[PDB]
Amino acid sequence: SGSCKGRCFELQEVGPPDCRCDNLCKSYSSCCHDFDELCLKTARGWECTKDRCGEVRNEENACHCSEDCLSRGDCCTNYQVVCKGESHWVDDDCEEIKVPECPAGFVRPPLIIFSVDGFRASYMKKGSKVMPNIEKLRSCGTHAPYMRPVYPTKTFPNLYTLATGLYPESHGIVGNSMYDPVFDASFHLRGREKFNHRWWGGQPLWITATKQGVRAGTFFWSVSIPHERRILTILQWLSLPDNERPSVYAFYSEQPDFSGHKYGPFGPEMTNPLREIDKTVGQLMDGLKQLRLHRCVNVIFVGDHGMEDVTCDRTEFLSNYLTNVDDITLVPGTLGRIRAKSINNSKYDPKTIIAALTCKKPDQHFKPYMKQHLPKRLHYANNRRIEDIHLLVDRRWHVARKPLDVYKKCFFQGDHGFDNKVNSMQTVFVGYGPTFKYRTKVPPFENIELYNVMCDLLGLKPAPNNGTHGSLNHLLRTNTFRPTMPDEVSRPNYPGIMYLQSEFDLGCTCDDKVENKLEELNKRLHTKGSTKERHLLYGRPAVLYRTSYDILYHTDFESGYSEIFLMPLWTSYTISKQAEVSSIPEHLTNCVRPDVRVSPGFSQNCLAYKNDKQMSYGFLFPPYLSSSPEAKYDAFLVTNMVPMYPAFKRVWAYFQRVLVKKYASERNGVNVISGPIFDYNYDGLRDTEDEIKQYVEGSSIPVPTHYYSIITSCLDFTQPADKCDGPLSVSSFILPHRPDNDESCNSSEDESKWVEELMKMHTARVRDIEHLTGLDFYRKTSRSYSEILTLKTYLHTYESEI
Ligand SMILES: *[C@@H]1O[C@H](CO)[C@@H](O[C@@H]2O[C@H](CO)[C@@H](O[C@@H]3O[C@H](CO[C@H]4O[C@H](CO[C@H]5O[C@H](CO)[C@@H](O)[C@H](O)[C@@H]5O)[C@@H](O)[C@H](O[C@H]5O[C@H](CO)[C@@H](O)[C@H](O)[C@@H]5O[C@H]5O[C@H](CO)[C@@H](O)[C@H](O)[C@@H]5O)[C@@H]4O)[C@@H](O)[C@H](O[C@H]4O[C@H](CO)[C@@H](O)[C@H](O)[C@@H]4O[C@H]4O[C@H](CO)[C@@H](O)[C@H](O)[C@@H]4O)[C@@H]3O)[C@H](O)[C@H]2NC(C)=O)[C@H](O)[C@H]1NC(C)=O
Ligand SMILES: O=c1nc2n(c3ccccc13)Cc1ccccc1/C2=C\c1ccc(Br)cc1
Ligand SMILES: [Ca+2]
Ligand SMILES: [K+]
Ligand code: NA
Ligand SMILES: [Zn+2]
C-alpha cells in the first residue's frame, strides 16, 4: 500500500508484505500502485530530437534533454550528440585503452554483462552489415570465433553456468523443465516455482560479489520492462555516490532467441531483431561516453546458445516404437528424458525401453542412452533431476511422445537444446575494456570458464567451480590469477628384477624360451629407461592422491603400474611417422609373461580370465607397434594387460592396429598416453577402490568403466612429435568400456565404417581425463603454464569450419 516515490529501481529488495520498487517486483505481483507512473515513464520516447535541447525539465518524460540532465544522470543516451555536437561512440576510431580512465571515486573498473539469448556464433559475420556497434566492440576488444555452451543447450542451464562456472549437473538447473523426486516438486519456465531458492545450486557471481563486499546490480529484469528502460536504469545507477554504486551490472535480451523460434536462425525476419540489439548496444555505449565511462567499464557481450532449423515435420514419435506409451512420462523436444509415469507401477522396466528404441529404423533420428553411458564430455548424469533414460536427438529433429502432443500443445521454425558440440548451437563472446586485450583473437572456449574471469575482473575470489582458473588469462591485459601446478601426492617406486619366473602361478603361458654381450647390455639400459626421452615427452604424469605404484621402463613404452588396481594407471609411447605396423606372430596369440619386477600378489593372473566367461583382456601398449621382434615380448607382460569385453576388443584393436599409425602419418609422429578409468558412480571423478562395482570373476581385478587416450603432437607438423620446438596439438577420447556395441548401429560391419565415428563421439578434454584419473599431465614442457591449461581444456570436435 506504500509508494515508489524516491525509490524507483531500488537496489535492495524490501521485505514482505511491503510494496516493492525494484526491477523484479512485476514478476512477483508486488509492485507499489504508483510504480508504472513514476518508474516506467514513456512520454516523448528515448531520443533527444533537435527541438528538445535546452528544454524546461518536465518530469513526465522517459528521459531528458534539459541543461541539468548531465547533473541528474538522466539524459537520453543521444543527448550530447543531438544537443552538444558530440559524435556517437561508434563513429570514433578505436584507441587502445592501456589503462583505466575513470572518474574520481571509482575503486575499480565497473563490469557490464550484456547477455543475448539465441545469438548464434555465425551472426557475427553473417549479420555484420547490420550490427556496427557490436562489430566495433568485436574488432577493438578481445573476441573468440565462438563460445561453446554446456549441454543441454537451453537458456536456463546456460545462463546459470555463466553465473556459477558449474556444470548443470552441479548447479542443478538441468533443463528448462525438471522434476525433483526428493522435494517432490516440478520446475517450469512459466510460473512462480522457478523463483524458489532450493532449485538453485552453487554460488553465482552476484552472491560471490556480495559476500566479498563488492556491490552488485539487481541482475534480473521483469519481462515487460522495455530494453531502453533497462539501459537508462543501469546508467542511473552508475551516477550513484561511491558507497551506493554497484560494481557489476547485467543486461539481458530475449532477442534474437524469441524471433529465432518463429522464423529460423536465418529467416529474413531475423535482420530486424539483430538491428535492434545493435541499437541497444549503441545506446549503452553512448550513455557511457556521456558519463565519461567509455574507457573505464569492462563490457562483456555474451550469448547463451545458438539456434538450428527445426520444423514440425521432423518429429520422431515414441508411439512408433513403443506399444504402451502411456506408462511413460517424456520431457520432449530437442532432448528426451524418460521416466515412469507412476512409481507404484513396477512393471515398467528401463532395460526393455532402451532395447525397444535401439537401432529400430534405418534412418533413426535419436539415440537412447542410460545417462551414465552418455559421452563424458557432456557431464550429464550426476543429478537426481536427470532421468535415467536419455535421448540424444539429431540436429534438426524433435522427439515427442505421441502425435497429439505436436499439433495440440507449423508453429515454430527454430530450436536449440542439442549436443553442445553442434555448430549451430555455438554462441559468441566479446570482451571490451581496459582489462581486456586490444584487437585480440583468442581460440574458442567453453562458457564454464567465464565465472573465473568475471571474478578476476572484479578482484574477487571464485567459489570452487568447473572452470580451470588460468586457462583464459590470455584474454586479459592484466590478471589477478597466476596458476601453480598441483603437488604430486604419491611418489613412484622403481622396481628392479626381484622375482624368479617359477614364483609365479598365474596360469599364464608363453612361447618365449628362444633368444650375447651385444643386446643384453642394450636391454639392461632399456629397463633402466634409456629410450624414455623418446616415449615420455612431457614428463611423468603426477599422481595427486595417496597410492602405491611402480614406474616400469621398456624399449617401446613406459608405464606407471598400480599395485592397488593391478594394472597400469597410464602407459606412454611415441610412434614416429616412419614406424611400421607388424602382426602378432601366430605362436604368441595367447602369450602372457610374468613381470619379474612385480610380485605375484600384485599381478593379474590368466586363470580368472579363463574362468570369467564374459571377460577377456587386451594390452595398453599394442604389440602391433613393437619396434623389433625382440621388443615385442615386452608388450606381452602381465603388467601391460587390462580387462576387456570381447565387444570392446573389436574397438580397441582397430584403434591400436590402424588409427594410431594413421595419426602418426597425418601429424608427423604422435605421443600416446592410454589408460583405464573407473567411474561407477558417474560423477566425472576418480573412484576409490571401494567404489568398484565389477571385478573379473573371483579375483580382485577391477573392471574399468572407460579407457582413455591422449594423443599429442607438434602444432607445427613440419616438426616430428619427438622433436617439437613450439606449441603442442592434442586430441583425446574417453571410450566407454561396454559388453556390447549397441551404441553403434553399424557395428556388424567392418570396423573401418563405425569405430572412428564412435571415437569422435567420445572425444574429451585432457582436463576431463584428469578429474577421472587423479593424474596431472604435461608437467615438464618448454611452454607456459597458462598455455598448457589452455591445451588441457581444448576439445577436438570434428565439426567442420563454422
Ligand atoms: C564441478 O565442480 C563442483 C564444485 O566444486 C564439484 O562438486 C563438488 O564436489 C565435491 C566432491 O564431490 C563435493 O563435496 C561434498 O560436499 C557434500 C556437502 O556439500 C554441501 O555443501 C556444499 C557447500 O555449500 C557451501 O559453500 C561454501 C563453502 O565453499 C559455504 O560458505 C556456504 O555456506 C555454502 O552453503 C554445497 O555446494 C552442496 O550443494 C549440493 O547440494 C545442494 C542441496 O542439496 C544443491 O542445491 C546443489 O546443487 C549441490 O548438489 C550437487 O552436489 C551433490 C553432491 O554434493 C550431488 O549429489 C548433486 O547431484 C549436485 O550435483 C551441499 O549443500 C558432503 O556431504 C560430501 O562429504 C562426504 O564425502 C566425503 C569424502 O571426503 C566424506 O569424507 C564425508 O564424510 C562425506 O561422506 C558422508 O556422506 C556420504 C554421502 O552422503 C556417505 O557416503 C558417507 O557414508 C558419509 O557419511 C563432500 O564433501 C561438493 O559438494 C561439490 N559441490 C557442488 C557445488 O556440487 C564437481 O566435482 C566438479 N565436477 C567435475 C567433473 O570436476
Ligand atoms: O533479466 C533477466 N536475466 C536473466 N534471465 C532472464 C530470463 C527472462 C527474463 C529476464 C531475465 C535468465 C537467467 C537465468 C539464470 C541466470 C541468470 C539469468 C539472467 C541473467 C544473467 C545475469 C548474470 C549472468 Br553472469 C548471466 C545471466
Ligand atoms: Ca566416480
Ligand atoms: K574369458
Ligand atoms: Na550395434
Ligand atoms: Zn529459445
JSON list of C-alpha atoms in Angstrom, two decimals, residues 38 71 83 126 171 275 300 308 364 438 471 540 549 629 727 744 750 782:
[
{"chain": "A", "resi": 38, "resn": "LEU", "atom": "CA", "xyz": [6.95, 7.05, -11.60]},
{"chain": "A", "resi": 71, "resn": "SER", "atom": "CA", "xyz": [23.97, 16.54, -13.30]},
{"chain": "A", "resi": 83, "resn": "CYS", "atom": "CA", "xyz": [22.37, 18.88, -28.46]},
{"chain": "A", "resi": 126, "resn": "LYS", "atom": "CA", "xyz": [26.65, -13.01, -41.45]},
{"chain": "A", "resi": 171, "resn": "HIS", "atom": "CA", "xyz": [24.32, -26.25, -10.26]},
{"chain": "A", "resi": 275, "resn": "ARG", "atom": "CA", "xyz": [19.43, -4.33, -35.87]},
{"chain": "A", "resi": 300, "resn": "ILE", "atom": "CA", "xyz": [31.10, -8.47, -21.80]},
{"chain": "A", "resi": 308, "resn": "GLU", "atom": "CA", "xyz": [19.06, -24.51, -35.51]},
{"chain": "A", "resi": 364, "resn": "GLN", "atom": "CA", "xyz": [16.51, -43.19, -36.81]},
{"chain": "A", "resi": 438, "resn": "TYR", "atom": "CA", "xyz": [43.25, -4.80, -27.72]},
{"chain": "A", "resi": 471, "resn": "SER", "atom": "CA", "xyz": [43.05, -21.21, -18.82]},
{"chain": "A", "resi": 540, "resn": "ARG", "atom": "CA", "xyz": [55.75, -38.39, -15.99]},
{"chain": "A", "resi": 549, "resn": "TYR", "atom": "CA", "xyz": [52.72, -47.53, -7.82]},
{"chain": "A", "resi": 629, "resn": "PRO", "atom": "CA", "xyz": [60.73, -58.89, -32.87]},
{"chain": "A", "resi": 727, "resn": "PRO", "atom": "CA", "xyz": [53.25, -25.33, -29.04]},
{"chain": "A", "resi": 744, "resn": "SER", "atom": "CA", "xyz": [26.93, -48.15, -32.94]},
{"chain": "A", "resi": 750, "resn": "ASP", "atom": "CA", "xyz": [33.79, -53.66, -40.78]},
{"chain": "A", "resi": 782, "resn": "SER", "atom": "CA", "xyz": [59.03, -25.64, -22.55]}
]
